[PDB]
Design a protein around this ligand. Structure first.
Ligand SMILES: Nc1ncnc2c1ncn2[C@@H]1O[C@H](CSCC[C@H](N)C(=O)O)[C@@H](O)[C@H]1O
Ligand SMILES: Nc1ncnc2c1ncn2[C@@H]1O[C@H](CSCC[C@H](N)C(=O)O)[C@@H](O)[C@H]1O
Lengths: 393, 393
């Protein structure tokens, strides 16, 4: 309410006067209450004007990024607009007008009428760091695809986008007949930033803590030879390392990391001593599962990138390798009906490449097509991210 | 400070509890305080999340609008996603996934597992109305232009765009020979939407209530043909209708509604009997004012669309048509320095069409260059909006 929002501000202001910085918990509670109060107070004209302001504050940030303006405003203190314009090589009037938008929305501050300064909200834009790369990748790569969606569905019909061909992304790029991978292969720099981005995306999901792997240990004692955990598309093997650190009774040397050859060779050359103790295999999980009869096959944050038919193809190759008692674990969001905001947004972004976040019933459909039955679903603390446990039907 | 902000929230809360209802001014003030709270507590990750939520929500709204979903969701009650999908002729799965984005933020409500309902936030999208038209103008006609700004300034240099030709909008449209008004005026559905949007946001752009016209009604008696008010670029004459309703002794038949040929022809097709009884007239105000000796020439929300020199040239044509007792009235946004929140947003948008928001002093310098003397400036008490009353120097 208005009063409880006031109470959280009074508390913040008092605690700062006491040299006690804000808790992350305290911060999320304050911004959540603000949003609640805004949703209660704002009328539709306020909602829509706030949305339009969001477009122009992002466009202003993008333009000042392009002009290298945030780098020229010093981390502390200020710079005169005239001096900023000289260093940029442009007209002080237009540079000032763009800065004034960000002054009016609290991103920058003016010291007098003559000078401009960073705030905490703009310092991440003044140099190299993951937030600035994440920001630029969302803006440059996704906003035009979002704007192209009405035209996309005009062309293809109001139908769920499911293939690796004719994606919204590739359509936006002008090459719907190519895969996003064929398109990105012609764009070195953008391929570099797409690799930065989705490695940062996997940083946000827990590797362990919500699923008990210890049932592997008695199987590992009964059999000295059976492969234990096969990580299909496991990137640099960090999930396997975390699992085996968590349960030392699972020898990483009896686990298998599968990925693309370029990923495996850099694991062979730079990864830790434990991940190099594992069996490392270049594979194409669209075509093959080479390890036969392992206790566990794990597919983590992969199926979300693909439509139902491509997922069933991936799963059927694994099922063919499974022994009757093997488990296939899918680590992904089991999105709710209706979904919470973060998975709902991620699902919208996945629609541009042919993927989606699946409900429990949708996961049951594709696992059954592949000859599997879901026997448990174990949820993490994060946004319905879960371990789906499957056995042969 | 946080403490003065909390204080304002608390006193707002008390009046509501105490029975007194929120006046329009108090609503605008509370929204302003909530924005100040946002600027004071948001961190970069909150800004990134808000940018992403705004862009995704806008794209979901635009798609569901384009698909006629909001039209098919009943005004109250709920409708099954399957019925909705059948009625719009689309796949229930992709329609649900998009609705789920709006459900997650509270724009739509989901009932049970399979029904969806409007809220007050989405009913504006269900049919044609001024607020929806304002939002569509921003989103369809300007958001793609924001994305062209870096290329535009790489093409023409980092300098304030002040020309009526080669605007960023015309650059994006591919029509270097045309002003923005001409571009819009050549497409019937874009024109129709623009006309409807001119009644929106009366909270920023009031049509009556800040300037007294009753002095015109005596002058009406002094002649039978003398034009009383000439509405230069008056769109569909909404402002003339509002003036003539407020002062019934100004007959609309003695008023002239002027606009581009494509706009004025559409006004003929969609206008009611009242405006069709005025004198409609195609003009080009960059080159002419063809009505000589009218009592009042009104120039409402025109000068904001053009740069200084162009505004002087437009005003000069009108000055040349004025009789000695004529008045030239400029109705427009008048903001401070730096601009307030809403004019700051519009100033950034207007840079794409060669215009800007202005202070009172900036307007005084332009009227002086045009040979006008300002005899009064009558501000709205609810908006940064004024009537600037002028006569020949
Ligand atoms: N056809 C293919 N065969 C094997 N691996 C592939 C593949 N296509 C993509 N990959 C790999 O699959 C991974 C998807 S990102 C998922 C990584 C990891 N499972 C996690 O915890 O998030 C990438 O590392 C990529 O290199
Ligand atoms: N060269 C020109 N000659 C006449 N009208 C023009 C014009 N260029 C733009 N316009 C008109 O200027 C108007 C700007 S929008 C302002 C409309 C109205 N006076 C109001 O305040 O509600 C539009 O209707 C547009 O069609």
């Amino acid at each position: 309410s208005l009063d409880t929002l006031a109470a959280k501000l009074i508390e913040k202001a008092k605690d700062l006067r006491a040299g006690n910085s804000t808790t992350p918990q305290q911060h999320e509670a304050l911004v959540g209450t603000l949003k609640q109060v805004q949703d209660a107070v704002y009328l539709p004209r306020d909602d829509l004007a706030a949305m339009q302001m969001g477009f122009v504050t992002a466009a202003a940030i993008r333009l000042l990024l392009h002009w290298k303006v945030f780098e020229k405003i010093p981390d502390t203190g200020s710079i005169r607009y005239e001096e900023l314009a000289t260093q940029v090589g442009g007209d002080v009037v237009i540079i000032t007008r763009i800065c004034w938008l960000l002054v009016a929305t609290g991103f920058l501050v003016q010291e007098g009428s003559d000078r401009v300064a960073h705030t905490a909200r703009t310092r991440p834009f003044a140099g190299v760091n993951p937030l600035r790369a994440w920001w630029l990748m969302g803006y440059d790569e996704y906003v035009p695809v979002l704007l192209a969606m009405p035209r996309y569905y005009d062309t293809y019909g109001i139908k769920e986008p499911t293939g690796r061909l004719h994606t919204i992304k590739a359509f936006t790029e002008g090459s719907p007949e190519l895969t996003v991978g064929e398109i990105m292969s012609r764009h070195p720099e953008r391929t570099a930033n797409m690799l930065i981005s989705m490695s940062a995306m996997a940083s946000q999901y827990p590797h362990t803590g919500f699923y008990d792997f210890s049932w592997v240990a008695p199987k590992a004692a009964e059999s000295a030879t059976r492969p234990l955990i096969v990580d299909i598309g496991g990137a640099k093997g960090w999930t396997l390392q975390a699992i085996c650190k968590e349960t030392p009774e699972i020898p990483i040397s009896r686990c298998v990391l599968q990925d693309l050859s370029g990923v495996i060779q850099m694991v062979q050359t730079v990864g830790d001593e434990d991940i190099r103790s594992a069996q490392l295999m270049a594979i194409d999980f669209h075509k093959e599962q080479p390890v036969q009869g392992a206790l566990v096959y794990m597919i983590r944050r992969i199926l979300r990138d693909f439509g139902d038919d491509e997922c069933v193809s991936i799963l059927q190759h694994v099922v063919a390798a499974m022994a009757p008692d093997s488990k296939l674990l899918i680590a992904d969001t089991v999105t709710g009906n209706p979904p919470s905001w973060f998975p709902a947004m991620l699902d919208f972004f996945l629609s541009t490449i042919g993927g989606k976040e699946r409900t429990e019933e949708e996961f049951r459909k594709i696992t059954a097509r592949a000859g599997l039955r879901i026997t448990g679903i174990h949820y993490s603390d994060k946004a319905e991210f879960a371990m789906i446990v499957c056995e042969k039907a």
